[PDB]
Design a protein around this ligand. Sequence first.
Ligand SMILES: Brc1c(Br)c(Br)c2[nH]cnc2c1Br
Length: 327
Amino acid sequence: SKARVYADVNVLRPKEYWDYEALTVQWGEQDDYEVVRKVGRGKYSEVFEGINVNNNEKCIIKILKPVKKKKIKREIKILQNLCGGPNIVKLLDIVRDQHSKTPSLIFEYVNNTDFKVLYPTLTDYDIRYYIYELLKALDYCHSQGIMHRDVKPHNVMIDHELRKLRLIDWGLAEFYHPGKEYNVRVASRYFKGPELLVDLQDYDYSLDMWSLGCMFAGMIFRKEPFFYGHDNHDQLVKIAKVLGTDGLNVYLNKYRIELDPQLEALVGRHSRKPWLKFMNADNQHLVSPEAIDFLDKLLRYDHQERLTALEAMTHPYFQQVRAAENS
Ligand SMILES: Brc1c(Br)c(Br)c2[nH]cnc2c1Br
């Protein structure tokens, strides 16, 4: 399996672009930034609201609990490579304690409203608008040879007053190299693509499109999380009860995958459930034939069949958003 789009990006670019293990950092002034309060909490990180003590502007400060040098370098190099791209969080500085050398990444501040509060207030047009903004970010990182691998509402900062969206938390992100077999312990359970759940290791940018689909379904139907599995095995079961097992069996056969017999028995046999069965009186103002058709073109077992971020942006569901972005 190889990516349909952007497959050879990292071949064409200089080795220094993607060879993050070779990164040297030019460390900024640690004293320029102070930590004000915790916005919590990592496993390696803690994140804080901070202040730039020069201009008094707010920032966000992520202190990287000490840390495999390799993953720190990966995150920094990716952030540097993407800085300036549309709707990508901006890494403003990189500093560290002169003695313990504890690094802190310094980000632009976004006045976020948590999705559990914000999403219930969004209109039909608001969802269209923000999903389009998110697709800009994904097409950009993909075009730059990078997979995000942790798309979810928790990683999408929105300042609703400012109509401003940023994709954050690039700590799971990776460079795409054709035929490379990646770690499947990526993304959050409810957002894991079928490829991760069946251990198809040579996945690509299209993983982010499945995740985006899960998020989208949650938003338009108000069923969050949309695929609500109790463990990684049950996650595949929940997906199967909706898309149906016919498509799952064809997918497994195509990529020459055989499920562990235990997981096969758990999945069972199911018919496809039509998307309209999720519509109800509470969510019907967010649901349209174009929303359903867009959803349907993202949530495919076969990662090769999913819309690319670029293709997604051409979907009729976005027609009014594109119309306003006009002179
Ligand atoms: Br506003 C914000 C930002 Br900008 C980042 Br980078 C972040 N990382 C973890 N949490 C956050 C927040 Br809440």
